[PDB]
Design a protein around this ligand. Sequence first.
Ligand SMILES: O=c1ccn([C@@H]2O[C@H](COP(=O)(O)OP(=O)(O)O)[C@@H](O)[C@H]2O)c(=O)[nH]1
Ligand SMILES: O=c1ccn([C@@H]2O[C@H](COP(=O)(O)OP(=O)(O)O)[C@@H](O)[C@H]2O)c(=O)[nH]1
Ligand SMILES: [Mn+2]
Ligand SMILES: [Mn+2]
Lengths: 337, 337
Amino acid sequence: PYSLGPKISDWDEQRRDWLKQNPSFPNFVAPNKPRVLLVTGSAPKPCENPVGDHYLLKSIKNKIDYCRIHGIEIFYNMALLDAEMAGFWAKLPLIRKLLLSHPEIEFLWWMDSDAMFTDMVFELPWERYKDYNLVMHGWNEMVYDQKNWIGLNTGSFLLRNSQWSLDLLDAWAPMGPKGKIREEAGKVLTRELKDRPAFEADDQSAMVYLLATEREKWGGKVYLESGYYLHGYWGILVDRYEEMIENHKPGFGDHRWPLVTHFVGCKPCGKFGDYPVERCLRQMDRAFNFGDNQILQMYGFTHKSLGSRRVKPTRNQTDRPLDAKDEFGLLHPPFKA
Amino acid sequence: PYSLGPKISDWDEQRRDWLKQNPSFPNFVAPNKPRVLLVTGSAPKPCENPVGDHYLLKSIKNKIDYCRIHGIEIFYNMALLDAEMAGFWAKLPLIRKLLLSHPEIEFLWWMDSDAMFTDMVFELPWERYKDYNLVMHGWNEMVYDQKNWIGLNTGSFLLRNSQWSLDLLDAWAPMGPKGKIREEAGKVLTRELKDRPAFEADDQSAMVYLLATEREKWGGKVYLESGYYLHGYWGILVDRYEEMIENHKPGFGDHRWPLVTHFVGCKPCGKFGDYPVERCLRQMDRAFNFGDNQILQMYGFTHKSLGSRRVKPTRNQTDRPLDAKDEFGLLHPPFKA
Ligand SMILES: O=c1ccn([C@@H]2O[C@H](COP(=O)(O)OP(=O)(O)O)[C@@H](O)[C@H]2O)c(=O)[nH]1
Ligand SMILES: O=c1ccn([C@@H]2O[C@H](COP(=O)(O)OP(=O)(O)O)[C@@H](O)[C@H]2O)c(=O)[nH]1
Ligand SMILES: [Mn+2]
Ligand SMILES: [Mn+2]
C-alpha cells in the first residue's frame, strides 16, 4: 500500500511552535501578504524533440520575471523522489517535501512548465483565500454536479501549509502509483466522470473524483476560482492577444488579460502532442512575448511583433532615466516592500 | 561613432536623491549586505546544437537555487538590445540599462550562462569590496605587468551602481561594435596582449587592454580577486570533485570547493568549441550534480553519483521533520532573515 510518508497529525502544532521559535522567518511577509513559494519543474533528461528544452527555458524565464516583480521565490525541481509517482503525479511527493521542509511557507503555488504568466501586473487576491486551504481554477457546478473531468485544473494551484493539506495529499495520491494501479484507476475515472477519455489516471481527474464524492470532507476549504485565469486554456486565449492589447491593459487577470496561459495538450517536450506542433510553438512564442512585452516596457523596449524574437525601442534614451514614467509601476512595485 | 547612450555625469547624485526619496527600496538589505541583482542570459533562438538548450535550463536552475538561498534577485535576458553589440558584447548595453533602471541595486552580478554555482554555502565577502566598484577574478601581475588576455575573467563579476561604473562602460564598449570595428580592434588586442590568439575583439581582452593601459584612472577601484573561484576554469576542477567531497565541505569557495565552475571553451549551445562537446557536456552534468547535491541534501536526497540523474534518499522519512536541521543550515540561512 503506497504512502507519501509517515503519517503526521500534529502539523498545525509543529508549525505553530516552529514559527514562535523562529520569528526571523514569519509565514506572512506583510500585513496581508503570505509567504509564497512557486514550485515548477520538468523531467531530468533532455526533451525528445530538441526545441522542447528551449521552450522550458523561456517558460522559467517567464516565471522568474513575474516572481521577481511580485516577490515570491521559485523552486525548480529536476528529480523524481518517488519512482511510483512519475509524470504529473510527481508533484505530490515534491509538494509534501517542500511543505514539511519549509514551515515558514504559508502558500505553495504549483505551476506546470507548460503554464506561462501573461499578466505581469495582476497580484493574487490573497485575502479572498484567507479561510481556504486549496485554490484551483474551476467551477463548482462542473466539479460537484456534472463531475466533469475538466471542472478544475491542477496545473496552477495554491496549497496552504497545514494539516488539512497533508491529509488532502494522502487522499489524492492513491490513484497515482504507476502500472496496474494507475491504469485500473483510469478506468474508474473514465467511467465515473463526464467527458473523460479513456487513459491512465491523472492528478486532475482524481481531484475532481475526490471532491465530487467526498465534498463534505474537503469542499469547505477548497476554493474553485473562476473570476480570473489562475489557469487559462490556451486554445481560446492566444488568438485574442491582439484584441487585448487594443482594448485593455495588464492587471485584469481575466478574459481581458489572462494571468496564466496554460498550453494544455501541446507537450513541447514530448514526441507528439494533442495539437499541431506548428500552432503550439508559434502560440507559445506569442504568449511568451505577450508577457515579455510587459517586462521590456519597463526598460524602453518591446518585441517588434508578437511572433518576433527581435525587439525595438519604445522611446529615445535619456540622461534623465529617473524621470521616466513606468507605466504600470513594475520597476518598484509594492510587492517588494 | 558608437555610444551606449546619452552622457550622464551626475548619476551618483541622482541615485542618492532617489534613495532618500524611496527608503522602502534600500541599496543595502541588511548591515554590510548590499542589494544584488544577478544577471545572465542567452540568445533568443534555440541552440544550434540542440541539446545545448537543456544545459541552459540546468544552468539557470542552478542559479535559481543559489540566488534563492542567498537572497539575490535574478534577471535573465533574452533580447539583443543593440544590433551593434552582438555576442559577448551584448552584456554592456544590458548592464547599463539595468543599473540606470534600478537605482536600488548596489551591485550587479553578471554571470555567464556556462558558469555554474558549485558552492551553495559560500557567501561573497562584500565588506572586502566596500571601497571598490569592479570585482573580477584575476591577478594583478598577469593583467598589469604581463598584459595577459587571461589575467582576468569577465564571465562572473560584480559592478557597483555608480557614475564610475557608467564611465567604465563608456571606456569598455569602443572595441565592441560588430564588423570592421571589432575585427580591427581584435588585431590590436592580439598584438598588444600576451598569448592572445587571433580573433575578433572580445570584452575580456578589451578589459585587460584597458586596465593595463590606463591603470591610474581605473585600477584603484578594481579588485582582482584570487582567494576564491568567483570564476573557476572547469579544466582544473571537474576531475577533482569526488576528492573534494571526501576531504572538504561546501563553504570554502576556493580550491577545496569552488564557488563557480565556468566552462570556458565548451560552447554547449553554439559550436566550434575549444574542446570536444562530449567531454564538455558530461563534465557539466557532473558540475550540475555537484552543486545540486547541496540543494537535494537539505531535503534528504542526493544523486547516486555525480554522473547519475537518479537521486537516492540520505535518511529515512520521519513524522518529526522539524527536529533535524540540515547539515549546513541552508533551509533557513541568515541571508533570508
Ligand atoms: O517528470 C516530470 C513530469 C512532469 N513534471 C511537471 O508536471 C507538470 C505536469 O505534468 P504533465 O505530464 O501533465 O505534462 P504537461 O502536459 O502539463 O506539460 C509538467 O508540466 C511538469 O512541469 C515534472 O516536474 N517532472
Ligand atoms: O546573444 C547573447 C550571447 C551571450 N550572452 C551571454 O554572454 C555570455 C558570454 O557570451 P559568449 O559569446 O562568450 O558565450 P560563452 O562561451 O561564454 O558561453 C553568455 O554566456 C551568455 O550568458 C547573452 O546574454 N546574449
Ligand atoms: Mn500542464
Ligand atoms: Mn562563459
